Write a protein that holds these residues in place. Sequence first.
Motif, PDB file in Angstrom:
ATOM      1  N   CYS A   1       4.192 -58.241  -8.449  1.00 17.75           N
ATOM      2  CA  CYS A   1       5.394 -57.473  -8.767  1.00 17.75           C
ATOM      3  C   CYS A   1       5.404 -56.141  -8.024  1.00 17.75           C
ATOM      4  CB  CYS A   1       5.491 -57.270 -10.281  1.00 17.75           C
ATOM      5  SG  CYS A   1       7.130 -56.671 -10.763  1.00 17.75           S
TER       6      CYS A   1
ATOM      7  N   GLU B   1      13.981 -61.727 -10.125  1.00 25.06           N
ATOM      8  CA  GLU B   1      13.255 -62.890 -10.664  1.00 25.06           C
ATOM      9  C   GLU B   1      11.794 -62.505 -11.029  1.00 25.06           C
ATOM     10  OE1 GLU B   1      14.733 -66.556 -10.370  1.00 25.06           O
ATOM     11  OE2 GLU B   1      13.192 -66.766 -11.920  1.00 25.06           O
TER      12      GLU B   1
ATOM     13  N   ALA C   1      10.027 -68.891 -11.302  1.00 23.66           N
ATOM     14  CA  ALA C   1      10.139 -67.812 -10.344  1.00 23.66           C
ATOM     15  C   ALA C   1       9.721 -68.242  -8.930  1.00 23.66           C
ATOM     16  CB  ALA C   1       9.322 -66.612 -10.808  1.00 23.66           C
TER      17      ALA C   1
ATOM     18  N   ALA D   1       9.859 -62.142 -14.815  1.00 26.80           N
ATOM     19  CA  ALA D   1       8.631 -62.871 -15.048  1.00 26.80           C
ATOM     20  C   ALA D   1       7.468 -61.946 -15.433  1.00 26.80           C
ATOM     21  CB  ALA D   1       8.276 -63.703 -13.821  1.00 26.80           C
TER      22      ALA D   1
ATOM     23  N   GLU E   1       7.148 -69.694 -16.799  1.00 23.34           N
ATOM     24  CA  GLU E   1       7.859 -68.527 -16.250  1.00 23.34           C
ATOM     25  C   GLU E   1       7.551 -68.358 -14.736  1.00 23.34           C
ATOM     26  OE1 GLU E   1       9.584 -65.865 -18.626  1.00 23.34           O
ATOM     27  OE2 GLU E   1      10.510 -65.462 -16.676  1.00 23.34           O
ATOM     28  N   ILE E   2       6.254 -68.389 -14.397  1.00 26.69           N
ATOM     29  CA  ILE E   2       5.826 -68.197 -13.019  1.00 26.69           C
ATOM     30  C   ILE E   2       6.312 -69.321 -12.128  1.00 26.69           C
ATOM     31  CG2 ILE E   2       3.784 -68.174 -11.567  1.00 26.69           C
ATOM     32  CD1 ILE E   2       2.574 -66.315 -13.748  1.00 26.69           C
TER      33      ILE E   2
ATOM     34  N   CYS F   1       1.191 -68.246  -8.242  1.00 24.93           N
ATOM     35  CA  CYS F   1       1.525 -69.496  -8.923  1.00 24.93           C
ATOM     36  C   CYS F   1       0.344 -70.461  -8.905  1.00 24.93           C
ATOM     37  CB  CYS F   1       2.766 -70.118  -8.278  1.00 24.93           C
ATOM     38  SG  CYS F   1       3.448 -71.444  -9.304  1.00 24.93           S
TER      39      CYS F   1
ATOM     40  N   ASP G   1       3.418 -68.797 -19.834  1.00 28.51           N
ATOM     41  CA  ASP G   1       3.284 -68.006 -18.630  1.00 28.51           C
ATOM     42  C   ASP G   1       3.447 -68.894 -17.378  1.00 28.51           C
ATOM     43  OD1 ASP G   1       2.902 -65.620 -20.069  1.00 28.51           O
ATOM     44  OD2 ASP G   1       0.758 -65.599 -19.707  1.00 28.51           O
TER      45      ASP G   1
ATOM     46  N   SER H   1       8.017 -60.407 -18.908  1.00 29.20           N
ATOM     47  CA  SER H   1       7.704 -61.440 -19.926  1.00 29.20           C
ATOM     48  C   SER H   1       6.215 -61.677 -20.105  1.00 29.20           C
ATOM     49  CB  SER H   1       8.444 -62.752 -19.623  1.00 29.20           C
ATOM     50  OG  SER H   1       9.846 -62.481 -19.474  1.00 29.20           O
TER      51      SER H   1
END
Lengths: 125, 125, 125, 125
Positions: free
Chosen positions: A85, A59, B63, A63, B59-60, B85, B56, A66
């Motif tokens: 990450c 996941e 996740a 992210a 996406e975050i 986040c 963005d 992207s």
Amino acid sequence: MHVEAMISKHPQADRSLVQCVEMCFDCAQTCAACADACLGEDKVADLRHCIRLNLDCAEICVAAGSIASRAATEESILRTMLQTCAEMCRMCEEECRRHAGNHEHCRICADVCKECETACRSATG
Amino acid sequence: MHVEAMISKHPQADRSLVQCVEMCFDCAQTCAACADACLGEDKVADLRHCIRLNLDCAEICVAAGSIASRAATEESILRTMLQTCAEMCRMCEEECRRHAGNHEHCRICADVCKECETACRSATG
Amino acid sequence: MHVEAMISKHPQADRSLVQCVEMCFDCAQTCAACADACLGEDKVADLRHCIRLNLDCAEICVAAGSIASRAATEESILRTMLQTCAEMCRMCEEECRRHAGNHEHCRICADVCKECETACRSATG
Amino acid sequence: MHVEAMISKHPQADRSLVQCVEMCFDCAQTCAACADACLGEDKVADLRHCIRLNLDCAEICVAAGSIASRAATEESILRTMLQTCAEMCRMCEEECRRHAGNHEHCRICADVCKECETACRSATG
Ligand SMILES: [Cu+]
Ligand SMILES: [Cu+]
Ligand SMILES: [Cu+]
Ligand SMILES: [Cu+]
Ligand SMILES: [Cu+]
Ligand SMILES: [Cu+]
Ligand SMILES: [Cu+]
Ligand SMILES: [Cu+]
Ligand SMILES: [Cu+]
Ligand SMILES: [Cu+]
Ligand SMILES: [Cu+]
Ligand SMILES: [Cu+]
Ligand SMILES: [Cu+]
Ligand SMILES: [Cu+]
Ligand SMILES: [Cu+]
Ligand SMILES: [Cu+]
Ligand SMILES: [Cu+]
Ligand SMILES: [Cu+]
Ligand SMILES: [Cu+]
Ligand SMILES: [Cu+]
Ligand SMILES: [Cu+]
Ligand SMILES: [Cu+]
Ligand SMILES: [Cu+]
Ligand SMILES: [Cu+]
Ligand SMILES: [Cu+]
Ligand SMILES: [Cu+]
Ligand SMILES: [Cu+]
Ligand SMILES: [Cu+]
Ligand SMILES: [Cu+]
Ligand SMILES: [Cu+]
Ligand SMILES: [Cu+]
Ligand SMILES: [Cu+]
Ligand SMILES: [Cu+]
Ligand SMILES: [Cu+]
Ligand SMILES: [Cu+]
Ligand SMILES: [Cu+]
Ligand SMILES: [Cu+]
Ligand SMILES: [Cu+]
Ligand SMILES: [Cu+]
Ligand SMILES: [Cu+]
Ligand SMILES: [Cu+]
Ligand SMILES: [Cu+]
Ligand SMILES: [Cu+]
Ligand SMILES: [Cu+]
Ligand SMILES: [Cu+]
Ligand SMILES: [Cu+]
Ligand SMILES: [Cu+]
Ligand SMILES: [Cu+]
Ligand SMILES: [Cu+]
Ligand SMILES: [Cu+]
Ligand SMILES: [Cu+]
Ligand SMILES: [Cu+]
Ligand SMILES: [Cu+]
Ligand SMILES: [Cu+]
Ligand SMILES: [Cu+]
Ligand SMILES: [Cu+]
Ligand SMILES: [Cu+]
Ligand SMILES: [Cu+]
Ligand SMILES: [Cu+]
Ligand SMILES: [Cu+]
Ligand code: NA
Ligand code: NA
Ligand code: NA
Ligand code: NA
């Protein structure tokens, strides 16, 4: 991948960034694959934590990949996302590595997570 | 949502966590919607940064919501992911807020991002 | 959720669509939660197929919810995506339902997948 | 990518499938990149539909790639998902192709979407 070709044609247009995007997508696919392989093992009960970490790593890596694909001068979450990450990949590597003697899929995955960790950390520089 | 009902039936089974998961999914949908609305405005050229930040943030937030759904004692990336986040939502809020006088969709989105930021920060405690 | 409020403020601006977006995100979270709960059960080896279907249903439901959030007159993949999501939810429901007598989390998930299936099919009309 | 290496080590262990997974992730990254590049063009107002289709194609391609990574004999959504991904890529290709004379990023993206379409259709066989 077409990461490098797309960066060069961006109207706002970095080796460390290309390597990071490539690795994030490689690592996302590998971790998704590793989780599925672990789920099919006789000994799946021993791999619960590994499966869970692989799911989180897939996941986060998608992210990050992207976000990084959209980071080719304006303010961005990129550097924060890449640190997260890198930490995710470090955690997932450690657990996959623990099973690498027993399951070849986990050896391959641990190697990819190690590489992705390095790539993401290098792109924060 | 069924966040609370699913947490209570987890074999390893937290108000701050439920609120965080709910908000992440709300905020993901709202930001995706805001980006699409901005893309349909006459004045889309003024909203480039907003669209990018919303993408963005969607996406975050997905996740983070997914990761948090799997965080109901073992080691986790959760607290790191929630900090990322929270930072993402703070950034997206600021830009959506700037357009809120001009576009009602951006006012709604800025309010949701503010709430999600608060929720995610509160769940790191 | 803010689905309804965002649709009404879209510059190109549907009850069936709002219900479909809401359900897709509910169902994505529920399936992700169900997979994680199944992974923590003593009897995880009996739940392999359920875990796998839940993972696919979470992925498809997020995608469908995102696509549908951007579907508020132009040509779209929406109706194709919603048919795929309806089929996914039907499959996941069937397997979760099979375990519902044994695991309460699977009963809740089977109910949400059934509702999401219905919602997605109704939005294709 | 490590698609081929991971398939061969799966405990339940296909050239068409490997090519499909590889292409889905390539195409997801390329479309995300194309949308961001379009958002930075002077002439962004002419690219609204392209940006929107690229966003949907990135979402669907990640989902398809993930699902396909878990498809290495049991019942699966794979073939349905790959048909949807093939249709998505066909649509996105057509619009990117229309802008390919004007924006090199759209030419590269149209070529990748065409290849991904072919790969996904070939894996349904
Ligand atoms: Cu990674
Ligand atoms: Cu990985
Ligand atoms: Cu594994
Ligand atoms: Cu991993
Ligand atoms: Cu990862
Ligand atoms: Cu990572
Ligand atoms: Cu990474
Ligand atoms: Cu990893
Ligand atoms: Cu791992
Ligand atoms: Cu593995
Ligand atoms: Cu692994
Ligand atoms: Cu790995
Ligand atoms: Cu792994
Ligand atoms: Cu990784
Ligand atoms: Cu990485
Ligand atoms: Cu959020
Ligand atoms: Cu949001
Ligand atoms: Cu917006
Ligand atoms: Cu946002
Ligand atoms: Cu967000
Ligand atoms: Cu957030
Ligand atoms: Cu959050
Ligand atoms: Cu946000
Ligand atoms: Cu925003
Ligand atoms: Cu907006
Ligand atoms: Cu906004
Ligand atoms: Cu927002
Ligand atoms: Cu926003
Ligand atoms: Cu948010
Ligand atoms: Cu939040
Ligand atoms: Cu659904
Ligand atoms: Cu679901
Ligand atoms: Cu479950
Ligand atoms: Cu499900
Ligand atoms: Cu689903
Ligand atoms: Cu569905
Ligand atoms: Cu659906
Ligand atoms: Cu489902
Ligand atoms: Cu299910
Ligand atoms: Cu369950
Ligand atoms: Cu279930
Ligand atoms: Cu379900
Ligand atoms: Cu389920
Ligand atoms: Cu569902
Ligand atoms: Cu649905
Ligand atoms: Cu594709
Ligand atoms: Cu693509
Ligand atoms: Cu583009
Ligand atoms: Cu595309
Ligand atoms: Cu695509
Ligand atoms: Cu596709
Ligand atoms: Cu595809
Ligand atoms: Cu595409
Ligand atoms: Cu396209
Ligand atoms: Cu482009
Ligand atoms: Cu394009
Ligand atoms: Cu493309
Ligand atoms: Cu494209
Ligand atoms: Cu594609
Ligand atoms: Cu494809
Ligand atoms: Na950017
Ligand atoms: Na967990
Ligand atoms: Na649309
Ligand atoms: Na499978």
